[PDB]
Each structure stands twice: as C-alpha cells, then as structure tokens.
Design a protein around this nucleic acid. Structure first.
Ligand code: MG
Ligand code: MG
Ligand code: MG
Ligand code: MG
Ligand code: MG
Ligand code: MG
Ligand code: MG
Ligand code: MG
Ligand code: MG
Ligand code: MG
Ligand code: MG
Ligand code: MG
Length: 74
RNA sequence: AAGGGGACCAGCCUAAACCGUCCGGCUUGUCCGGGCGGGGUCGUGGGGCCCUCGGACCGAAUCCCCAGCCUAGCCGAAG
C-alpha cells in the first residue's frame, strides 16, 4: 500500500516520499500517529502542488539574489 | 427462448471532464475537500476543452381551465 510520509522514518523513507507498506502497518501505526497519509490521487496532488510551490519560491530567491548580484559586483 | 400474430405504446433525469460561486482544512495555494449553480447524457460512439463555420420550430409524465363521468333525482304512450 502506497503512503506519503509526513516525517523522515529511519529505514523507511524521507519526508514527502512515497513508500510501499503493508495495509496493517499503515492503518494501525502510521496513519494514527500522523507519520504518513494515504497516497491517494487527491493528496498526491497536494504533495505535488507543494513540491511545485517550494520550487517556485526557491528559484524566485535564486533570482532576486542575482538581480542584486547585478547592481553590486559592478 | 428466438421468431410470428395481437393488446398497448414513450421515453427521460443524472455521475464524470470543464466553468462559476460559497463554505473550511492547514501542509498557503495554480491546493485538497464539502455544498450549490452551469455544462453533459451517448453506440451511426457520445461528451468536455480549443479553434474555424452557421442563429425559430418541438414540447411534457408538471400546473391551470373545460368537456365528459360519479355521488340525489325527473318526464315518459294507450280501455
Ligand atoms: Mg416475443
Ligand atoms: Mg411479437
Ligand atoms: Mg384490449
Ligand atoms: Mg415503442
Ligand atoms: Mg478560503
Ligand atoms: Mg472535490
Ligand atoms: Mg465545488
Ligand atoms: Mg447530443
Ligand atoms: Mg469524441
Ligand atoms: Mg418528465
Ligand atoms: Mg312516470
Ligand atoms: Mg303509464
């Protein structure tokens, strides 16, 4: 069963990563303890749209810096 | 059972794509979810979106009126 980790779990996966676990593990351990969420279509988009937003506000930083490296350095 | 002969006869509304709006979720938006409205309903496949072209006739199974009908009755020839 595919789940999206909400946290880094040792010998499991990284936060935001999609891993495969047995249904019992997900239903009776991860989901109740807030450690993961079902890799459903609905929030596979939620993860995706946040990976997209994080990249958006990052490349905006690496370009509002360069526009300052423009004025300075000259 | 098909088929044939007859009785009767009638076909419609949705879900999803996509659009809009409201609400709340927290993991902040190009988000996800819930409601509502639009859109759509098909097998010659149909629909959505995007271009190009083109701009009155049907009509309920719903509501209204009426005829007709029922729930009392009446006239009715000639020793
Ligand atoms: Mg028959
Ligand atoms: Mg027949
Ligand atoms: Mg008959
Ligand atoms: Mg018929
Ligand atoms: Mg809001
Ligand atoms: Mg939804
Ligand atoms: Mg909605
Ligand atoms: Mg059609
Ligand atoms: Mg088609
Ligand atoms: Mg109807
Ligand atoms: Mg009499
Ligand atoms: Mg008499």
């Amino acid at each position: 069963m595919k789940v999206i980790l909400l946290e880094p779990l040792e010998n499991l996966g990284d936060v935001g990563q999609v891993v495969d676990v047995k249904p019992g593990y997900a239903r009776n351990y991860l989901l109740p303890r807030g450690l993961a969420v079902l890799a459903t279509e609905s929030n596979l988009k939620a993860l995706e749209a946040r990976i997209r937003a994080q990249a958006k506000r990052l490349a905006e930083r690496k370009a509002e810096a360069e526009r300052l490296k423009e004025i300075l350095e000259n």
